[PDB]
Amino acid sequence: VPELPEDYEISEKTIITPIGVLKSAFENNIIIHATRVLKEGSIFCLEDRTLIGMLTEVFGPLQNPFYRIKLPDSKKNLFDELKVRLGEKAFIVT
Amino acid sequence: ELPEDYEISEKTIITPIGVLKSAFENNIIIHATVLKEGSIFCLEDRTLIGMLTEVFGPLQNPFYRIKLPDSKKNLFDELKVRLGEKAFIVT
């Protein structure tokens, strides 16, 4: 599985592409509801380039998938921050 | 798809199955701690969650997704508020 350093920040230049809506946060999982050309290892972020993390699992029906991003323990602070931002548009870095 | 008048009768065997962890977009997510296709989930007071719609997650610690229909919005809102409670499987 793949993991993201802490000082990794999405540069303000890079292209960001809308992908879905942050819908859920439990147990260090972040759930995004699909709304868009995705990879293994694609990185999700919010519009302000707050980095969410890397795709862990795709589930739900093919038409409107749900994406699950599992954060590691070291990323608890980030989890709590996202927990509180449910409903914001999520994006996939390219 | 369950009828309206359907409630779990207090007489029926219930079985712990996981913990209610999440509710969004009419889905209820349960974290596992036998199950059949078409098994009914409920809480310990027999409050009906609904019928299994999807098994995902890793094989060791699955998650269960129950999609409720629009007509059961009131029940979603009630379950939304009850996160963390033990879930059970009817038998």
| CATH code (residue A8) | 2.40.10.230
CA-to-CA distance for A32 and A68, rounded, in angstroms?
Answer: 6
Measured CA to CA in angstroms, residue A4 lies from A46, A54, B1, B49, B68 at distances of: 16, 8, 42, 37, 35
Residues spanned by the domain of A59 = 1-94
Q: How big is the CA angle at A60 (ends B27 and B47), to the nearest 5 degrees?
A: 25
The residue type of B7 is E
Residue A52 tokens read as: 């969410």
Looking at the complex, does the CB of residue B83 fall below 8 Å from at least one CB of chain A? yes
The number of residues making up chain B comes to: 91
Looking at the complex, does the CB of residue B56 fall below 8 Å from at least one CB of chain A? yes
Cα torsion through A7, A8, A9, A10, rounded to 10: 170
Closest CA to B20 of B69, B71, B89, B72: B89
CA-to-CA distance for B88 and B33, rounded, in angstroms?
Answer: 11
Q: What is the resolution of this structure in A?
A: 2.7
Q: How was this structure determined?
A: X-ray
Strand partners, B89: B15, B41
No. of helices (H) and no. of strands (E), chain A: 1, 7
Q: Are A26 and B57 in contact (CB < 8 Å)?
A: no
Sequence-distant (6+) residues with CB within 8 A of B82 are: B20, B43, B47
CB atoms within 10 A of CB A82: 22
User: What domain count does chain A have?
Assistant: 1
Q: Is the Cβ–Cβ distance between A30 and A5 less than 8 Å?
A: no
